[PDB]
Amino acid sequence: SGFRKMAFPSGKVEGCMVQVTCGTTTLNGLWLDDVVYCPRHVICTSEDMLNPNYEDLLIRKSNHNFLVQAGNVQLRVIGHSMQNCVLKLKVDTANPKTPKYKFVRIQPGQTFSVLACYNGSPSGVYQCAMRPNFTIKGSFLNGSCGSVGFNIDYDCVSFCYMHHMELPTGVHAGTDLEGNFYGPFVDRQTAQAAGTDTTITVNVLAWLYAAVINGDRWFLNRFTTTLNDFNLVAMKYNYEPLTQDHVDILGPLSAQTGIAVLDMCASLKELLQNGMNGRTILGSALLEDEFTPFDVVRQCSGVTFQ
Amino acid sequence: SGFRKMAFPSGKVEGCMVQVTCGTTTLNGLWLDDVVYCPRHVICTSEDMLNPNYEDLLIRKSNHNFLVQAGNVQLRVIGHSMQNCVLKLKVDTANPKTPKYKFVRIQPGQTFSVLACYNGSPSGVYQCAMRPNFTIKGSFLNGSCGSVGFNIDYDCVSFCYMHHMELPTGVHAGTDLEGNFYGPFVDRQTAQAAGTDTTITVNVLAWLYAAVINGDRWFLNRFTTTLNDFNLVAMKYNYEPLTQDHVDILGPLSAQTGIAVLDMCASLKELLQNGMNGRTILGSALLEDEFTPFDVVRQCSGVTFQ
Numbered sequence A, B: 001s002g003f004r005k006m007a008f009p010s011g012k013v014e015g016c017m018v019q020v021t022c023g024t025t026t027l028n029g030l031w032l033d034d035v036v037y038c039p040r041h042v043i044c045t046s047e048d049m050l051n052p053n054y055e056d057l058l059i060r061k062s063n064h065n066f067l068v069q070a071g072n073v074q075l076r077v078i079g080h081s082m083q084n085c086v087l088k089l090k091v092d093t094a095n096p097k098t099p100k101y102k103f104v105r106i107q108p109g110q111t112f113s114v115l116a117c118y119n120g121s122p123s124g125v126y127q128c129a130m131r132p133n134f135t136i137k138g139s140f141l142n143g144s145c146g147s148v149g150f151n152i153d154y155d156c157v158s159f160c161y162m163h164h165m166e167l168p169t170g171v172h173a174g175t176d177l178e179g180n181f182y183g184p185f186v187d188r189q190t191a192q193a194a195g196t197d198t199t200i201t202v203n204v205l206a207w208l209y210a211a212v213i214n215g216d217r218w219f220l221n222r223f224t225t226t227l228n229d230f231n232l233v234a235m236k237y238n239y240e241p242l243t244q245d246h247v248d249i250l251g252p253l254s255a256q257t258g259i260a261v262l263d264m265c266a267s268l269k270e271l272l273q274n275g276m277n278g279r280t281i282l283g284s285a286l287l288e289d290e291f292t293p294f295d296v297v298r299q300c301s302g303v304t305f306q
């Protein structure tokens, strides 16, 4: 029993983090096989940062301008290339700890673990959601760039995120491991706006099912609703429209708890309209939206990895 | 910027988790050097837990009744002993992945990372506090006993917790790695009460300092108070009394934010008396008490380990 924001064990990723230095700037990179992946702004100087021409800054640099070290081991760089917003440095030695791995572009509302790193060394791990406006609510300081987010499916690490910037509002933005930003952001020292963020309805409902599985049941009611009528209440309170694909995803949970999806929608509707009344669900006074239905199912059925 | 409940990177601990089988029952153990540590109730049969005589169940068992598996490697058991509520299995081979480590008995209000495991393999990691009533608010299913809690200081893992039971109210209890329970709990299927749980006042203030560091400042006020006067407010509201030791520990944070401890107590008093008014602090509608002052400084100044 109990239910926590839980991250994936980070052993397989800690083994891949290295420090990458170019001139003054140091950040993190990801060492897999014979390639190190790192954010490309490692090649900026404190002036050229307000609008860099990265194709023309990469030209002033040769391999040996790139200092890569795994722990105290220095790696020899034997090639370098730019793909979108990441640099890829070919190194002489292939990471003996390379896990079996995939590169995956994640979808809004999906969750992943972040291993926050500084100077190539892990500091901590936490779970995160890719918000609908393509930001994440993380904990990142100077030097954190190159930190990666990931999921683990059995033995396979799915890398989905590399960290690149903090926006004005204090949320975070970054790329997939192909260097393509999530969202409309660019890697330049400019003030960029994220759009308005809705709440992930399908996740809030999966959390209500976790609550019920764990004994927390005061929010259950006698009522019902329809997908279209609840969706009017979702608009008003800034929740993503709920779809029949979402309904289908909540079904194994609906079928474990004996509570049909649309009656759980009805319980939610009434929490949105009247609030919680100073009570709590799974220890929270707010509606939590960073658990996918998969997360709820992993944590209530006990899925392992190694 | 940002602030999350972060766990320590779990790599050094994953290398130590193994499976321990005694008849029908399988749970987790901790392999360090040539010794495996696991909860002694691995030797109970599904009947005997209501009142076990552990010395007399442990006598019916020989080395070879204990099957240890580290991944797929079966370890040979060459000795066994009971120390308080933990079994110690002497195995022929020393764990090649043994980190530098100590066993530590932590104090109420200190935090630690939990690596939750099943069948000897890691499922996930989250951060936890030892409540004042010596329980923890975790996420543990059947098979999770033997999961351990730990802190990392640079290169040394400090093991502080091994998981043994869930109480009626759905909180959790366990031992230090010498097998002594935190709290008044015993390892038998009996009706056991956690005491009344107070809130960890020194941690709530540490979270308010974190909030201010990160821009959340709306709870700051013009008023002040005294140590004895706020403590009258802490009693009524179920908070542990604040001491000048606590003041002294909150001082480096008071000196980073330019806010003396007693002015921050004053902000808290009025949150306790008036609520939050539908607002949030660091994304929470509740007052968080599972960040120690140390945790706040680790996360706001970016401390690393590996």
Ligand SMILES: *C(=N)[C@H](C[C@@H]1CCNC1=O)NC(=O)[C@H](CC(C)C)NC(=O)c1cc2c(OC)cccc2[nH]1
Pocket (backbone or CB within 6 Å): A027, A041, A044, A049, A140, A141, A142, A143, A144, A145, A146, A163, A164, A165, A166, A167, A168, A172, A186, A187, A188, A189, A190, A191, A192, B001
């Ligand atoms: C990576 N090391 C760092 C991570 C930030 C540091 C502070 N918290 C983070 O998450 N990234 C950056 O510093 C990034 C570098 C560019 C060249 C890609 N810049 C920013 O992240 C940045 C610029 C900025 C402005 O205008 C300059 C205004 C508000 C916020 C902001 N953030």
Ligand SMILES: *C(=N)[C@H](C[C@@H]1CCNC1=O)NC(=O)[C@H](CC(C)C)NC(=O)c1cc2c(OC)cccc2[nH]1
Pocket (backbone or CB within 6 Å): A001, B027, B041, B049, B140, B141, B142, B143, B144, B145, B146, B163, B164, B165, B166, B167, B168, B172, B186, B187, B188, B189, B190, B191, B192
């Ligand atoms: C260990 N593998 C397991 C962990 C539990 C499983 C369910 N959630 C957990 O945390 N421990 C036990 O099953 C433990 C066995 C020993 C201590 C004999 N028993 C309990 O944890 C337990 C007994 C109990 C009773 O019986 C009076 C009543 C309410 C709750 C409860 N929990």
